[PDB]
Design a protein around this ligand. Sequence first.
Ligand code: CA
Ligand code: CA
Ligand code: CA
Ligand code: CA
Lengths: 138, 24
Amino acid sequence: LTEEQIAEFKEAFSLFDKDGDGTITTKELGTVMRSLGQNPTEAELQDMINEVDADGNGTIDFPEFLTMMARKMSEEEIREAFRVFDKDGNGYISAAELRHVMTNLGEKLTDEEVDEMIREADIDGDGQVNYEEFVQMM
Amino acid sequence: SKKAVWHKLLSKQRKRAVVACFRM
Ligand SMILES: [Ca+2]
Ligand SMILES: [Ca+2]
Ligand SMILES: [Ca+2]
Ligand SMILES: [Ca+2]
């Protein structure tokens, strides 16, 4: 369990911990799920928290989050993210692949925005974003 | 400058992947 990995999981935790108080509540999980277009019932929220809430106090602290995330062992989050973008797995993110992710995550797009995004990331000028370019941009 | 859009997507993708973990 290296210090580098623990830091990456801390950053992930902070995307859920809306008040920064070090715990994830059902309300905070529900807020994130709704911003992604999902609408879990308050009972599904409680059951997701419960499967992770080792001490039974009803909220998820960082050690409990770390246990959940550790169990699955996947690759580093940044490699995981690249695979989401590069759906055909050839090691390059195309304009069509970037449009797909933007659409799936509910981000409005224009062709000129997408071209400028690739252009900013595209160090070698081949018209696509490879892994090295992706990591440097992110 | 479009780095903010890339970073917004990365943040949303990470939240989505953690939610998937909670669903499992
Ligand atoms: Ca909190
Ligand atoms: Ca707890
Ligand atoms: Ca590709
Ligand atoms: Ca390139």
